[PDB]
Amino acid sequence: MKNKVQLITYADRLGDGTIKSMTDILRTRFDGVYDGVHILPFFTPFDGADAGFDPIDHTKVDERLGSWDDVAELSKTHNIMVDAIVNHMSWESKQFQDVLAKGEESEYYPMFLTMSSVFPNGATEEDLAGIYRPRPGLPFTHYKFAGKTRLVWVSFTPQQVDIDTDSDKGWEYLMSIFDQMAASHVSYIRLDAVGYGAKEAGTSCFMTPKTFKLISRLREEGVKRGLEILIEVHSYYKKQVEIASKVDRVYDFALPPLLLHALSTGHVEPVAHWTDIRPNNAVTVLDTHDGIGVIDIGSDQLDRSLKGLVPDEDVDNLVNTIHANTHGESQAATGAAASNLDLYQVNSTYYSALGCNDQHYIAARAVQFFLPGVPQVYYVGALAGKNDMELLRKTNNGRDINRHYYSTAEIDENLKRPVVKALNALAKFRNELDAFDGTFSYTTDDDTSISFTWRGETSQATLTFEPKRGLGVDNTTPVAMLEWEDSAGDHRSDDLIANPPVVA
Amino acid sequence: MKNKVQLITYADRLGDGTIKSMTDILRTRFDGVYDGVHILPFFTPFDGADAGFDPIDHTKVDERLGSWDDVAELSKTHNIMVDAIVNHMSWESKQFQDVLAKGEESEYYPMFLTMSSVFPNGATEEDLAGIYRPRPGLPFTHYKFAGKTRLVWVSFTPQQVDIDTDSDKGWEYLMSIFDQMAASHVSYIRLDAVGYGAKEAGTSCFMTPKTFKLISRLREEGVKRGLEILIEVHSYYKKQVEIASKVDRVYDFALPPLLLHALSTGHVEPVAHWTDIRPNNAVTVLDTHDGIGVIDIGSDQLDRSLKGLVPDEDVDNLVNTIHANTHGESQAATGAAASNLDLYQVNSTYYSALGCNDQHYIAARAVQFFLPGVPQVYYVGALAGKNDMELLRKTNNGRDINRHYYSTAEIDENLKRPVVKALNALAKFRNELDAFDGTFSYTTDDDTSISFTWRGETSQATLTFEPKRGLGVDNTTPVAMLEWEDSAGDHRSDDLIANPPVVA
């Protein structure tokens, strides 16, 4: 994976509404800033039950957004990452509709999981209560197969029916997706919700050895097609650490909340510890298209004796701090407060989670960019966006608070903001200084500060992060300083917003 | 049960917000209009997860609303109906909390239903898939009993934990409720969601023979205490017809949608047929505190070959007509559009469902009052209230569209409206003419009109209902005429709004 900053975006929420428009925005407003892009699900349809993650036809671009040729055109200037939704599909798919109509007489009957598919001889309370769930309630919903009521396995919305990834029909479907991407100039594949892909009676059905087998098989199929794979796994941190050695890349989901913790409390020890044990074959982020994950650093939900990267007390304080910083906005969008698929992810834009503090935000991005891994910036964060309460009101979908629709006009106005210019400059710096393609090292001043250093072919840079320099949502004191050497001398910025770094 | 019109109301949504104020409003604004009252759950708390139906302490009046003394005061002038929430209680109740803390060591462990309680030897998909549900999804949620994750039975919100009505502790609790009501001057008891009260592996767990046993046992306890029982059952109409012979009263839930059908299409034959087979030991309504039930007249949900009171196409047209008449308001509050416990009830005030046609509305009330049974008028309907979109957008609870908070000031403002004056006059008429305590008969002019007649000791009255006279939400032609004889001779009203009937 090219070691350049990538943008995560919906094709219709950045620009006029199409892949063409999104491409124009990338090329004319973010040239040299974002050299790659993860286009969130743009298949048919992109506006269903779960904003693209419930595809009727995963291999067909929603014609309202564009075509595969638009993706091909985009590939000329940007490396592209696309999702491979391997765990489920829309109940409106031709395949599932056939099952509803013909039941067991459907050739697609084996393609979908039902309670009986996994528990042919029935299940005890323990069996069902043991299935890992990101929210309360069992992963089953009612559907009539040729008139007979059946309990179909559904990990997320009831409209997303889980497929049997070990069935012939299911595997054929997954390979059709891989073939399409390999033929459409896609460079990277994001295995969506892969941790749920394998079901087995008596197990948690989440990140088990059976799941590892699925992941390994999918990786092999990727290799055969020249595709690198990134897996999405929101879990107890140790599961991320263990699975990372088996895949090209994993997301670093611990950093986002660890930084919110550090910026709010001034404690950097947790960040130092994570730097020491974290998987380095990562894709770093602050914000994603979902809510801010907190169980990603807390204790194991299935076994609380296994503590996280910080005490659960600190996770709870972190959550309340976000609610405080957003003046209740995140409280109105999180968990049971609105429509959500995850009870604990905190729904809020990252900028709003920090109380819109520019110095804290640019510092968080700086730390993200300095940790080993390919960095990704979510489009809302790329424009330092605030919570969209109007969108939340309209849809009542918790995550929409962090999914604002940015018109071209709004993008241009936001590009004038000091913090946005600062981020564009920082990303450009991260793409142009060759130090980042060299060796990494770090030192820490006992829970007070941490310095990240990169030494490359013709340059080097050291980022010093000291949150205690500017606690408070109204803080204007920089909490990160950057020293670097390039072909044009030895430089230093003590304020990434007033003095953004520029490579000679 | 006295054969006088009753009002259904929340103690805090009619007046200043207390039982005392609600009482004052009844006595000073509705004297002679509403002689009885069903006070919706006013226990601790009244503003929890399901507006009173998730009690922490069913025997304690919420201190913010008043006290049992206030109920005693009210009883001096009005017969009171109160709910006996026999199927579940709040998860915040002392009993359930004790179970969460001590698990099996809690003396209340047997009081609550879990998957294992009902399925001790495990369950097959068929066992679980067959459980009747008013909406998709299994009736279970996760709770930790002394650290151990358990699947607790929850028919409605996850906060309303179902009790084992067959357990000693469960029965003791239910009897504590009956005892409290008998000691607090309550006259009538409404058995809330009693149809769900009995669970048995292999059955639908809804209105089954085991359910009948529970209903019969509860009726006996009511009889022993001098309390009459009304059971709430939303189901295929035949279930209501059959259970009626075993209880004092059942609700007439078929009439509301049948009248919407009659008023929108002009067809009265369905009403004639229902008049012929309906249980006459009923409590009649148009609107309730919940949504308008339509499966109450449609085909059976389990076996669709068991037809309803009108063709399925007509039920579908009825639903679409309500959504159309409210210009999308009811669609925004119904089903998966908002938080709901029932997927098919249509959330809209009855007046709004009729496109606010006064003549249609007063005619519907006249028919309601002319069919055998004790009439109840929901407070929103008592004030011919329109959909409350302001409240709906604030709570996102679908049923709130039909739960407006009426200040005393707003009540007086609405009492000036001709349609509201007409309803007050009609209810008074229904309470003063002794014809309604006499013999009932009816004639019909083949699907065009139906005339209901009551002949009493010193009076007689005939209501002629003919929707065809004035179809359309915008029509001003009366669709009901009333003729009657009292001590002052023969009388006639050809417009219940312009010329309300007054007993001489």
CSV table of C-alpha atoms in Angstrom, one decimal, chain A residues 194-499:
chain,number,residue,atom,x,y,z
A,194,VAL,CA,-15.1,-9.9,8.4
A,195,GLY,CA,-14.9,-10.7,12.1
A,196,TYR,CA,-18.5,-11.8,11.9
A,197,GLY,CA,-18.1,-13.9,8.7
A,198,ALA,CA,-17.9,-17.3,10.4
A,199,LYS,CA,-20.7,-18.9,12.5
A,200,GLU,CA,-20.3,-22.0,14.6
A,201,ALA,CA,-22.6,-23.4,17.3
A,202,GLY,CA,-21.1,-23.0,20.7
A,203,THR,CA,-18.8,-20.2,19.8
A,204,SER,CA,-19.0,-16.4,20.0
A,205,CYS,CA,-19.1,-16.4,16.2
A,206,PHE,CA,-16.7,-13.5,16.3
A,207,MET,CA,-13.0,-13.7,15.5
A,208,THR,CA,-12.7,-17.4,16.2
A,209,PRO,CA,-10.4,-19.9,14.5
A,210,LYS,CA,-13.1,-20.5,12.0
A,211,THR,CA,-13.1,-16.8,11.3
A,212,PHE,CA,-9.3,-16.9,10.9
A,213,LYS,CA,-9.7,-19.6,8.2
A,214,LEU,CA,-12.1,-17.4,6.3
A,215,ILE,CA,-9.8,-14.4,6.5
A,216,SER,CA,-6.8,-16.5,5.3
A,217,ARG,CA,-8.8,-17.9,2.4
A,218,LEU,CA,-9.9,-14.4,1.4
A,219,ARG,CA,-6.3,-13.1,1.7
A,220,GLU,CA,-5.2,-15.9,-0.7
A,221,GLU,CA,-7.9,-15.0,-3.2
A,222,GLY,CA,-6.7,-11.4,-2.9
A,223,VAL,CA,-3.1,-12.4,-3.6
A,224,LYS,CA,-4.0,-14.4,-6.6
A,225,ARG,CA,-5.7,-11.2,-8.1
A,226,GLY,CA,-3.0,-8.8,-7.0
A,227,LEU,CA,-5.2,-7.2,-4.4
A,228,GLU,CA,-4.0,-6.2,-0.9
A,229,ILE,CA,-6.5,-6.6,1.9
A,230,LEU,CA,-7.4,-4.4,4.9
A,231,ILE,CA,-9.7,-6.0,7.4
A,232,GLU,CA,-12.2,-4.1,9.6
A,233,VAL,CA,-12.3,-5.4,13.1
A,234,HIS,CA,-13.7,-3.5,16.1
A,235,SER,CA,-12.8,-5.6,19.1
A,236,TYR,CA,-10.8,-6.1,22.3
A,237,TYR,CA,-7.4,-4.7,21.3
A,238,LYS,CA,-5.6,-8.1,21.7
A,239,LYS,CA,-7.7,-9.6,18.9
A,240,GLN,CA,-6.4,-6.9,16.6
A,241,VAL,CA,-2.9,-7.5,17.6
A,242,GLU,CA,-3.2,-11.2,17.0
A,243,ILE,CA,-4.9,-11.1,13.6
A,244,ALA,CA,-2.6,-8.4,12.3
A,245,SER,CA,0.3,-10.8,11.5
A,246,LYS,CA,-2.0,-12.7,9.2
A,247,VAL,CA,-3.2,-9.9,6.9
A,248,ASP,CA,-1.6,-7.1,4.9
A,249,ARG,CA,-3.2,-4.4,7.1
A,250,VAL,CA,-5.5,-3.8,10.1
A,251,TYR,CA,-7.0,-0.5,11.2
A,252,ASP,CA,-5.5,1.2,14.2
A,253,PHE,CA,-8.8,1.7,16.1
A,254,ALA,CA,-7.1,2.3,19.5
A,255,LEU,CA,-5.5,5.5,18.5
A,256,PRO,CA,-8.7,7.6,18.0
A,257,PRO,CA,-9.9,7.3,21.6
A,258,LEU,CA,-6.4,7.2,23.1
A,259,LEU,CA,-5.8,10.6,21.6
A,260,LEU,CA,-9.1,12.0,22.8
A,261,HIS,CA,-8.1,10.7,26.2
A,262,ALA,CA,-4.6,12.3,26.0
A,263,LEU,CA,-5.9,15.6,24.8
A,264,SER,CA,-8.6,15.8,27.5
A,265,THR,CA,-6.4,14.6,30.4
A,266,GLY,CA,-2.9,15.3,29.3
A,267,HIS,CA,-1.9,11.6,29.9
A,268,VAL,CA,0.3,10.2,27.1
A,269,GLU,CA,1.4,7.0,28.8
A,270,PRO,CA,-1.4,5.1,27.1
A,271,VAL,CA,-0.3,6.3,23.8
A,272,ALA,CA,3.3,5.4,24.6
A,273,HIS,CA,2.2,1.9,25.6
A,274,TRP,CA,0.1,1.4,22.4
A,275,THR,CA,3.1,2.6,20.3
A,276,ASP,CA,5.1,-0.1,21.9
A,277,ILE,CA,2.8,-3.0,21.2
A,278,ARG,CA,0.6,-1.9,18.3
A,279,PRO,CA,0.5,-3.7,14.9
A,280,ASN,CA,2.6,-1.5,12.6
A,281,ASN,CA,1.1,-2.9,9.4
A,282,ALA,CA,-1.8,-0.5,9.9
A,283,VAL,CA,-4.1,2.0,8.3
A,284,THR,CA,-4.4,4.9,10.7
A,285,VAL,CA,-7.5,7.0,11.3
A,286,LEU,CA,-9.0,9.4,13.8
A,287,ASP,CA,-12.5,9.4,12.4
A,288,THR,CA,-14.3,6.9,10.1
A,289,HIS,CA,-17.7,6.8,8.5
A,290,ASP,CA,-19.0,5.2,11.7
A,291,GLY,CA,-18.9,6.4,15.3
A,292,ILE,CA,-15.8,6.6,17.5
A,293,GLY,CA,-15.0,3.2,18.8
A,294,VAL,CA,-14.3,2.9,22.5
A,295,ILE,CA,-14.5,-0.9,23.2
A,296,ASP,CA,-11.4,-0.9,21.0
A,297,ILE,CA,-9.4,0.2,24.0
A,298,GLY,CA,-11.5,-1.0,26.9
A,299,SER,CA,-11.8,-4.4,28.6
A,300,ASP,CA,-13.1,-7.5,26.7
A,301,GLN,CA,-16.9,-7.6,26.7
A,302,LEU,CA,-17.1,-11.4,26.9
A,303,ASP,CA,-14.5,-11.4,29.8
A,304,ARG,CA,-14.0,-8.3,31.9
A,305,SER,CA,-10.9,-9.7,33.6
A,306,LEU,CA,-9.0,-8.9,30.4
A,307,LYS,CA,-8.4,-5.2,30.7
A,308,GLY,CA,-8.0,-2.8,27.9
A,309,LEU,CA,-5.3,-0.2,27.1
A,310,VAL,CA,-6.7,2.1,29.8
A,311,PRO,CA,-8.9,1.3,32.8
A,312,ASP,CA,-12.6,1.1,32.1
A,313,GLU,CA,-13.0,4.1,34.4
A,314,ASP,CA,-11.0,6.1,31.9
A,315,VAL,CA,-13.1,4.9,29.0
A,316,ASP,CA,-16.3,6.0,30.8
A,317,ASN,CA,-14.8,9.4,31.5
A,318,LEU,CA,-13.7,9.6,27.9
A,319,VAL,CA,-17.3,9.0,26.7
A,320,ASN,CA,-18.7,11.6,29.1
A,321,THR,CA,-16.1,14.1,28.0
A,322,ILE,CA,-17.3,13.7,24.4
A,323,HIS,CA,-20.8,14.2,25.6
A,324,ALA,CA,-19.7,17.3,27.5
A,325,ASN,CA,-17.7,18.7,24.6
A,326,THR,CA,-20.6,18.4,22.2
A,327,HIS,CA,-23.1,19.9,24.6
A,328,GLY,CA,-25.3,16.8,24.5
A,329,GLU,CA,-25.2,16.3,20.7
A,330,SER,CA,-23.3,13.0,20.9
A,331,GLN,CA,-25.6,11.9,23.7
A,332,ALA,CA,-28.6,12.4,21.4
A,333,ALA,CA,-27.0,10.3,18.6
A,334,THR,CA,-25.3,7.6,20.6
A,335,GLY,CA,-26.5,4.1,21.5
A,336,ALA,CA,-30.2,3.7,22.4
A,337,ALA,CA,-30.7,7.5,21.9
A,338,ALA,CA,-31.1,6.9,18.2
A,339,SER,CA,-31.0,4.2,15.4
A,340,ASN,CA,-27.7,2.5,15.8
A,341,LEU,CA,-26.1,-0.9,15.1
A,342,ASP,CA,-23.5,-0.5,17.8
A,343,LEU,CA,-24.4,0.4,21.4
A,344,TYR,CA,-21.1,1.9,22.5
A,345,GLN,CA,-19.5,3.6,19.5
A,346,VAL,CA,-19.8,7.3,20.2
A,347,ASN,CA,-21.5,9.2,17.4
A,348,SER,CA,-19.8,12.5,16.8
A,349,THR,CA,-17.4,14.1,14.3
A,350,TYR,CA,-13.9,13.9,15.7
A,351,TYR,CA,-13.6,17.7,15.5
A,352,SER,CA,-16.8,18.1,17.6
A,353,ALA,CA,-15.6,15.4,20.0
A,354,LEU,CA,-12.7,17.7,20.8
A,355,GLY,CA,-15.0,20.7,21.3
A,356,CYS,CA,-13.8,22.1,18.0
A,357,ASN,CA,-10.4,22.9,19.4
A,358,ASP,CA,-8.1,23.5,16.4
A,359,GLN,CA,-4.8,23.1,18.2
A,360,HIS,CA,-6.0,19.7,19.7
A,361,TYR,CA,-7.3,18.6,16.3
A,362,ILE,CA,-4.2,19.4,14.2
A,363,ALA,CA,-2.1,17.8,16.9
A,364,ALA,CA,-4.2,14.6,16.8
A,365,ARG,CA,-3.7,14.5,13.0
A,366,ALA,CA,0.0,15.0,13.5
A,367,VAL,CA,0.3,12.1,15.9
A,368,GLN,CA,-1.8,9.9,13.6
A,369,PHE,CA,0.5,10.7,10.6
A,370,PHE,CA,3.6,10.0,12.7
A,371,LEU,CA,2.7,6.5,13.8
A,372,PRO,CA,3.7,3.7,11.5
A,373,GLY,CA,1.0,2.9,9.0
A,374,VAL,CA,-0.8,4.4,6.0
A,375,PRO,CA,-3.0,7.3,7.1
A,376,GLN,CA,-6.6,7.9,6.1
A,377,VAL,CA,-8.6,11.1,6.8
A,378,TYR,CA,-12.4,10.9,6.7
A,379,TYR,CA,-13.9,13.6,4.5
A,380,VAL,CA,-15.8,15.3,7.4
A,381,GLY,CA,-12.6,15.5,9.3
A,382,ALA,CA,-10.7,16.7,6.1
A,383,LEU,CA,-13.0,19.7,6.3
A,384,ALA,CA,-12.9,19.9,10.2
A,385,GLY,CA,-16.6,19.4,10.2
A,386,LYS,CA,-19.0,19.8,13.2
A,387,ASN,CA,-21.9,17.5,14.1
A,388,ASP,CA,-24.8,17.6,11.7
A,389,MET,CA,-27.8,17.8,14.0
A,390,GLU,CA,-30.2,18.6,11.1
A,391,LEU,CA,-29.3,15.4,9.2
A,392,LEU,CA,-29.6,13.4,12.5
A,393,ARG,CA,-33.0,15.0,13.0
A,394,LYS,CA,-34.1,14.1,9.5
A,395,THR,CA,-33.0,10.4,9.5
A,396,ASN,CA,-32.7,9.6,13.2
A,397,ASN,CA,-29.7,7.5,12.2
A,398,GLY,CA,-27.1,8.1,14.9
A,399,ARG,CA,-24.1,7.9,12.6
A,400,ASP,CA,-25.5,10.6,10.3
A,401,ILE,CA,-24.3,13.2,12.8
A,402,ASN,CA,-20.9,12.5,11.2
A,403,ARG,CA,-22.1,12.1,7.6
A,404,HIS,CA,-22.7,15.7,6.4
A,405,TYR,CA,-23.4,16.4,2.7
A,406,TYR,CA,-20.7,18.8,1.5
A,407,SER,CA,-21.6,20.8,-1.6
A,408,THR,CA,-18.8,22.1,-3.7
A,409,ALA,CA,-19.6,25.6,-2.4
A,410,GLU,CA,-19.3,24.5,1.2
A,411,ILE,CA,-16.0,22.7,0.5
A,412,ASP,CA,-14.5,25.9,-1.0
A,413,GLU,CA,-15.7,28.0,2.0
A,414,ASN,CA,-14.2,25.5,4.5
A,415,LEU,CA,-10.9,25.4,2.6
A,416,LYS,CA,-10.4,29.0,3.8
A,417,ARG,CA,-10.4,28.0,7.5
A,418,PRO,CA,-7.0,28.1,9.2
A,419,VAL,CA,-7.4,24.6,10.6
A,420,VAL,CA,-8.4,23.1,7.3
A,421,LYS,CA,-5.5,24.8,5.5
A,422,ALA,CA,-3.3,23.4,8.3
A,423,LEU,CA,-4.5,19.9,7.8
A,424,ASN,CA,-4.1,20.1,4.0
A,425,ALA,CA,-0.5,21.3,4.6
A,426,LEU,CA,0.2,18.6,7.1
A,427,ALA,CA,-1.1,15.8,4.8
A,428,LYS,CA,0.9,17.2,1.9
A,429,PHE,CA,4.0,17.3,4.2
A,430,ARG,CA,3.3,13.7,5.2
A,431,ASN,CA,3.2,12.7,1.5
A,432,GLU,CA,6.3,14.7,0.4
A,433,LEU,CA,8.9,14.3,3.2
A,434,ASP,CA,10.8,11.0,2.6
A,435,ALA,CA,11.5,10.6,6.3
A,436,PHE,CA,8.2,8.7,6.6
A,437,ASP,CA,9.4,6.0,4.2
A,438,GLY,CA,12.4,5.4,6.5
A,439,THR,CA,13.0,4.3,10.0
A,440,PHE,CA,10.7,5.0,13.0
A,441,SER,CA,11.7,5.6,16.6
A,442,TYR,CA,10.2,7.4,19.6
A,443,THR,CA,11.0,8.5,23.1
A,444,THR,CA,8.7,9.4,26.0
A,445,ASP,CA,8.9,11.9,28.9
A,446,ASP,CA,7.1,9.9,31.5
A,447,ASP,CA,3.4,10.4,30.8
A,448,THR,CA,4.0,14.1,30.0
A,449,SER,CA,5.2,14.0,26.4
A,450,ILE,CA,6.2,11.7,23.6
A,451,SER,CA,8.4,12.4,20.6
A,452,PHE,CA,8.0,10.5,17.3
A,453,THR,CA,10.9,10.5,14.9
A,454,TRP,CA,11.4,9.4,11.3
A,455,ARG,CA,14.7,9.3,9.4
A,456,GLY,CA,14.7,8.9,5.7
A,457,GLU,CA,16.9,9.1,2.6
A,458,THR,CA,17.2,12.9,2.5
A,459,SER,CA,15.2,14.1,5.5
A,460,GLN,CA,14.1,13.5,9.1
A,461,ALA,CA,11.3,14.8,11.3
A,462,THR,CA,10.5,14.7,15.0
A,463,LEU,CA,7.0,15.4,16.4
A,464,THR,CA,6.8,16.3,20.0
A,465,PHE,CA,3.3,15.8,21.6
A,466,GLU,CA,2.6,17.4,25.0
A,467,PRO,CA,-1.1,17.8,25.7
A,468,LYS,CA,-0.6,19.3,29.1
A,469,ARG,CA,0.6,22.4,27.4
A,470,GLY,CA,-2.9,23.2,26.4
A,471,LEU,CA,-5.8,21.5,28.3
A,472,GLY,CA,-9.3,22.9,27.9
A,473,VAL,CA,-11.7,23.1,24.9
A,474,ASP,CA,-11.0,26.8,24.6
A,475,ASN,CA,-7.3,26.3,24.6
A,476,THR,CA,-5.3,28.1,21.9
A,477,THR,CA,-1.8,26.9,23.0
A,478,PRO,CA,-0.2,24.5,20.6
A,479,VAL,CA,0.2,21.0,22.0
A,480,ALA,CA,2.5,19.7,19.3
A,481,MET,CA,5.8,20.9,17.9
A,482,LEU,CA,7.5,19.7,14.7
A,483,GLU,CA,11.2,19.8,13.9
A,484,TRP,CA,12.4,18.5,10.5
A,485,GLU,CA,15.3,18.6,8.1
A,486,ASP,CA,14.9,18.5,4.3
A,487,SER,CA,17.0,19.4,1.3
A,488,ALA,CA,16.5,23.1,2.2
A,489,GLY,CA,17.7,23.2,5.8
A,490,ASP,CA,16.7,22.5,9.4
A,491,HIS,CA,13.2,23.7,10.3
A,492,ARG,CA,10.8,23.9,13.2
A,493,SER,CA,7.2,24.7,13.8
A,494,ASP,CA,5.9,25.4,17.3
A,495,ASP,CA,2.3,25.9,16.0
A,496,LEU,CA,1.1,23.7,13.2
A,497,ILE,CA,-1.8,26.1,12.4
A,498,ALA,CA,0.1,29.4,12.3
A,499,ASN,CA,3.3,27.7,10.8
